Amino acid sequence: KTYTLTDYLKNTYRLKLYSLRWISDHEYLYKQNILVFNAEYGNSSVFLENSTFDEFGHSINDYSISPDGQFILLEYNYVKQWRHSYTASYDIYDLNKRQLITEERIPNNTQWVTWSPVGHKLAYVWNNDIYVKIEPNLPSYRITWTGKEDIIYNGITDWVYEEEVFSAYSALWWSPNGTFLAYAQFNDTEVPLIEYSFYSDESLQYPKTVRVPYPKAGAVNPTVKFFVVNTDSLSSVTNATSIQITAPASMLIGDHYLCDVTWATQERISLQWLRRIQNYSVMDICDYDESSGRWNCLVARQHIEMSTTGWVGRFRPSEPHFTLDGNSFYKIISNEEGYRHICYFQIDKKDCTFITKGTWEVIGIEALTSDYLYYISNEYKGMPGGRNLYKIQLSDYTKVTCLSCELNPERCQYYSVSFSKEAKYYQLRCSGPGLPLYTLHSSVNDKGLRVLEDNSALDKMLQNVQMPSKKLDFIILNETKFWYQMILPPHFDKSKKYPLLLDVYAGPCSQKADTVFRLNWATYLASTENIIVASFDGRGSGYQGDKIMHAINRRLGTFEVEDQIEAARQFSKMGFVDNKRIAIWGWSYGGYVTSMVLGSGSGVFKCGIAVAPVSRWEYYDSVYTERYMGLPTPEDNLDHYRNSTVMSRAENFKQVEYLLIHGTADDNVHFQQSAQISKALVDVGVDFQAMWYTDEDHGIASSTAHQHIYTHMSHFIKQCFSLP
Numbered sequence: 223k224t225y226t227l228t229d230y231l232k233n234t235y236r237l238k239l240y241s242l243r244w245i246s247d248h249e250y251l252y253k254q255n256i257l258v259f260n261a262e263y264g265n266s267s268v269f270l271e272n273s274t275f276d277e278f279g280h281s282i283n284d285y286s287i288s289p290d291g292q293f294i295l296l297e298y299n300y301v302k303q304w305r306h307s308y309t310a311s312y313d314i315y316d317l318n319k320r321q322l323i324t325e326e327r328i329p330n331n332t333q334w335v336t337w338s339p340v341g342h343k344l345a346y347v348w349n350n351d352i353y354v355k356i357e358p359n360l361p362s363y364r365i366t367w368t369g370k371e372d373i374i375y376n377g378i379t380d381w382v383y384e385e386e387v388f389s390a391y392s393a394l395w396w397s398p399n400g401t402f403l404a405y406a407q408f409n410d411t412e413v414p415l416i417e418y419s420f421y422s423d424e425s426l427q428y429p430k431t432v433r434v435p436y437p438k439a440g441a442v443n444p445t446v447k448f449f450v451v452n453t454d455s456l457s458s459v460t461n462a463t464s465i466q467i468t469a470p471a472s473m474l475i476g477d478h479y480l481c482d483v484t485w486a487t488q489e490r491i492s493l494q495w496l497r498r499i500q501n502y503s504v505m506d507i508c509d510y511d512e513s514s515g516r517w518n519c520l521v522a523r524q525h526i527e528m529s530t531t532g533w534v535g536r537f538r539p540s541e542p543h544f545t546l547d548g549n550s551f552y553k554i555i556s557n558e559e560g561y562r563h564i565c566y567f568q569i570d571k572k573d574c575t576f577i578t579k580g581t582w583e584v585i586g587i588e589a590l591t592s593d594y595l596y597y598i599s600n601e602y603k604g605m606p607g608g609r610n611l612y613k614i615q616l617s618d619y620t621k622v623t624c625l626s627c628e629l630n631p632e633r634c635q636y637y638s639v640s641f642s643k644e645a646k647y648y649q650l651r652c653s654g655p656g657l658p659l660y661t662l663h664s665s666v667n668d669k670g671l672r673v674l675e676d677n678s679a680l681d682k683m684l685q686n687v688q689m690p691s692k693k694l695d696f697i698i699l700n701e702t703k704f705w706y707q708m709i710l711p712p713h714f715d716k717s718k719k720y721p722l723l724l725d726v727y728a729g730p731c732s733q734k735a736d737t738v739f740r741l742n743w744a745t746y747l748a749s750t751e752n753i754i755v756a757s758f759d760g761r762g763s764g765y766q767g768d769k770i771m772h773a774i775n776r777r778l779g780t781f782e783v784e785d786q787i788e789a790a791r792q793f794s795k796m797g798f799v800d801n802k803r804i805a806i807w808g809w810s811y812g813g814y815v816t817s818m819v820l821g822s823g824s825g826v827f828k829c830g831i832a833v834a835p836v837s838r839w840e841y842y843d844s845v846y847t848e849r850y851m852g853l854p855t856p857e858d859n860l861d862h863y864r865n866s867t868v869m870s871r872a873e874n875f876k877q878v879e880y881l882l883i884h885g886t887a888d889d890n891v892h893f894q895q896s897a898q899i900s901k902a903l904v905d906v907g908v909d910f911q912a913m914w915y916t917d918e919d920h921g922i923a924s925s926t927a928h929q930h931i932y933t934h935m936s937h938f939i940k941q942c943f944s945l946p
C-alpha cells in the first residue's frame with residue numbers, strides 16, 4: 223500500500239515527540255499523567271496524577287509550574303486569537319497543600335500569565351493592563367492604568383509586533399531573579415484598522431465586522447515605549463512607579479521598533495531598537511541606579527548593527543547572550559564576507575572579535591557556560607540545510623567539537639537542542655533525514671545517556687507502506703550553489719517521465735530544501751499519485767550568506783521568482799520530468815511567488831495553486847514588507863511596489879490553469895489580496911478556479927477546512943496531471 227491522502231488528513235502514521243520542560247539543572251517533566259524524570263538515572267515519580275483535577279469541571283489546556291515548584295498554574299477556557307495571542311481563564315494550585323486558591327483569583331479572559339524566573343511571583347495581563355501577584359493567594363497590584371482595547375497594549379503585543387517582531391503575544395520580561403519586571407507599551411491610536419466580515423455560526427443573522435489595528439506597508443505604525451518596574455518595592459497604598467527607558471537619540475529621529483529585550487544581569491538590561499528603514503539597529507545597555515532609582519543607558523555602551531546591502535538580522539537583529547558577570551556578550555552578526563557568525567562583544571568596546579569563520583552560517587547560540595559556548599550551524603559537509611550542535615572552547619576558538627555530527631550520519635543531519643537550567647545536560651532533537659530521534663546527553667563528558675524516543679513504532683508501520691525518498695542536492699547558477707530537494711515517488715525510475723509539482727515559499731531567508739523528515743501533502747503526492755514534489759532555494763533564501771539572501775533586497779517578486787522558473791527549467795533537463803506536466807503551488811509568500819511565476823508567461827508551468835497569497839505589497843503589513851521593500855513612496859521604492867504586483871500579470875494567466883484559495887477571516891494576508899487577483903483575472907477575461915473558506919484564517923487550520931482544502935487541491939492537481 224501507499225501513503226494515501228486519508229493517511230495524511232487523518233494522521234494515520236503519527237510521528238512521536240518527546241517534549242520536555244526543564245525544571246532544574248538535572249530534572250525535566252513529561253506528559254504520559256505528569257512525570258518528572260531525572261537526567262542522571264531516568265527514574266520518574268509522578269508530579270501530578272492524570273486526574274488530580276477530575277472534579278474541576280473544565281478541560282485543562284496547559285499547565286505551568288513555578289520555578290521553585292511550590293505552585294502550578296492551570297490554563298483553561300482557551301480562546302485563540304492570532305498566531306500566538308490568545309485568551310484563557312487561570313487557576314493556581316498549591317502543591318504543598320493540594321488545593322486550588324479561591325480568594326483573589328486571576329480574572330476571566332486573561333491575555334498573558336508568567337511566573338518570575340525564580341520563586342512564585344506572578345505577572346498577568348488583563349484588559350491590556352499589567353498585574354502582579356507576589357503570592358498566589360494575596361491580591362494583585364495593578365501596574366498600568368493606560369490599557370485600552372485595540373488602542374493601548376501593556377505587556378502584550380499588538381497585531382504587528384506579535385506576528386513580525388516578537389513571535390509572541392507577551393511583552394513582559396522578568397529580571398533573572400524576578401526583582402524587576404520589564405515591559406513594553408504599544409500605541410495603536412492612529413494605526414488604521416483592517417475590516418472584514420465574520421459570518422460565524424448559521425445562527426448569526428447579521429455578519430460581524432472584525433476590525434483589527436493593522437499597519438499595511440507605509441501606513442501609520444504603532445509606537446513603542448519601554449518601562450521597568452520594581453516588584454520588590456511594590457505598595458498596596460500608592461500607585462506602582464514605572465521607570466521609562468526612552469529609545470536612543472538615533473531612533474527617536476523617526477519611526478522605530480523595539481526588536482529585542484534581553485536581561486544581562488540582575489541590574490542590567492539590553493534593549494535593541496530598529497529604525498523603520500530596517501538597515502540600522504542599536505543596542506542600549508542600561509544599568510539600574512541606586513539613589514536615583516532610575517535606569518541609565520550610557521551612550522558609550524551603544525552597539526550598532528547595520529547593513530549597507532540589505533536589512534539588519536535575518537528577520538530581526540539576533541539576541542545577545544551575556545557572560546555571567548554581564549560585561550561581555552556573544553551574538554550572531556554577518557561578517558565582512560557576508561556570512562553570519564558569532565561575534566564576541568565587550569560592553570565598553572566598540573569592536574567585536576568573530577569566534578567563528580567560514581562559508582556557512584551559525585543558526586543560533588544555544589547555551590553559554592563558564593567554559594564553553596554551544597551553537598547550531600549548517601557547517602557539516604557544507605550543507606546549508608543541515609543542523610548540528612557544536613561546542614566551542616572559550617580559551618581557544620580553534621578548539622571546536624561537533625557534538626551531533628557523527629552520532630548517526632545516516633539518519634540524523636538536522637538537530638535542535640534543549641539544555642538544562644545551567645546547561646549540565648542537553649536533549650538532542652533529530653528531525654531528519656531518517657525518522658526523528660530524541661536523545662539525552664550529559665554535557666560534561668559528552669556521552670549519550672539514553673534514547674528517549676526512536677520512533678520505532680512508526681518505523682515498523684512504514685516498513686509495510688511504499689514510502690517516497692528525498693534527494694537533497696544542489697545546482698550551479700552563475701557559478702553559485704543553489705540547493706534543491708525532491709520528494710521522489712516509490713520505486714523511482716529514471717527512464718520514466720514524471721509530473722513535477724514545485725513546492726514554493728521562496729521568501730527572504732526561506733529554506734525549503736533541507737534534511738528534515740516530514741509526513742505531509744507532498745508525501746501523499748509522491749507515494750500515491752507518483753508526482754515528484756520539489757522545492758528550491760534560490761536568491762533570497764537564507765543560511766548561505768547575505769550575498770544570496772540580500773539578492774532580492776528592495777526587489778521582492780524578481781530574482782526569487784525567476785529562480786523558481788529556472789529551477790523547474792533545470793529539472794526538465796534532468797530527463798525524468800514530464801515537461802508537459804509541471805505545476806507550482808505555495809502558501810502565503812509561496813502563494814505570491816506561485817502567482818507571479820504563473821503570471822510570467824514563461825510557458826514552463828501548466829497549472830498552479832496559490833493559497834492565501836500576497837497579491838501586492840501595499841496590502842501586507844509594514845514590518846515584514848518594509849524590511850525588504852522600504853516605503854511605497856515616490857522618493858523611496860514605490861516604482862517597484864507597482865511593478866511587483868500579480869494583478870499586473872493577469873493577462874498571462876491565459877496560458878496557465880490557476881486555483882486561487884483564501885480564507886475569509888484571514889487576519890494575516892487579508893482576503894482583500896485574492897479579491898484583487900480574482901477581479902484582475904476577471905477584467906482580462908481569464909478563466910480560473912477559486913475557493914474561499916468562510917471564517918478560516920491564514921492557517922486554514924480547522925480540522926474540516928484543512929481536510930477540505932487538501933482534498934480540493936488534490937483534485938485540481940490530479941485533474942491537471944491527467945490522473946484518475
Ligand SMILES: *[C@@H]1O[C@H](CO)[C@@H](O[C@@H]2O[C@H](CO)[C@@H](O)[C@H](O)[C@H]2NC(C)=O)[C@H](O)[C@H]1NC(C)=O
Pocket residue numbers: 368409411412
Ligand atoms: C498614543 O498616541 C496617541 C496619538 O498619537 C496620543 O493621543 C494624543 O494625545 C495628546 C495628549 O494626550 C492629544 O493632545 C492628541 O490630540 C492625541 N492625538 C490623537 C489623534 O489621539 C495618546 O495620548 C498616546 N497614548 C498614550 C497616553 O500613551
Ligand SMILES: *[C@@H]1O[C@H](CO)[C@@H](O[C@@H]2O[C@H](CO)[C@@H](O)[C@H](O)[C@H]2NC(C)=O)[C@H](O)[C@H]1NC(C)=O
Pocket residue numbers: 367459460461
Ligand atoms: C492610581 O492611578 C489611577 C489612574 O490614574 C487612579 O484612578 C483614577 O483616579 C482619578 C482621580 O483620582 C480619576 O479621574 C480616574 O477616573 C481614575 N481612573 C481609574 C478608574 O482607574 C487611582 O486613583 C490612582 N491611585 C491612587 C489613589 O494613587
Ligand SMILES: Cn1c(=O)c2c(-c3ccccc3Br)c(CN)c(N)nc2n(C)c1=O
Pocket residue numbers: 385386537727729809810811812836842846890891
Ligand atoms: C511560507 N511562509 C511565509 O509565508 C512566512 C511569512 C509570510 C510572508 C509573506 C506573507 C505571509 C507570510 Br505568513 C512570514 C512573515 N509573516 C514569516 N515570518 N514566515 C513565513 N514562513 C516561515 C513561511 O514558511
Ligand SMILES: *[C@@H]1O[C@H](CO)[C@@H](O)[C@H](O)[C@H]1NC(C)=O
Pocket residue numbers: 258259260263265266267
Ligand atoms: C530517583 O531516585 C532518587 C533516590 O535518591 C531520588 O532522589 C529522585 O527523586 C528520584 N527521581 C524521581 C523524581 O523519581
Ligand SMILES: *[C@@H]1O[C@H](CO)[C@@H](O)[C@H](O)[C@H]1NC(C)=O
Pocket residue numbers: 327328329330
Ligand atoms: C468566570 O465567569 C463565569 C461565568 O461566566 C464564572 O462562573 C466564573 O466563576 C468566573 N471566573 C472567575 C473566578 O472569575
Ligand SMILES: *[C@@H]1O[C@H](CO)[C@@H](O)[C@H](O)[C@H]1NC(C)=O
Pocket residue numbers: 399401488489
Ligand atoms: C535579586 O537581585 C537584586 C538585584 O541585584 C538583589 O537586590 C537581591 O539580593 C536579589 N534577591 C534575592 C531574593 O536573591
Ligand SMILES: *[C@@H]1O[C@H](CO)[C@@H](O)[C@H](O)[C@H]1NC(C)=O
Pocket residue numbers: 499501502528529530531776852
Ligand atoms: C538604508 O537603506 C536606504 C535605501 O533603502 C539607503 O539609502 C541607506 O543608505 C541605508 N542605510 C544604511 C545605514 O546603510
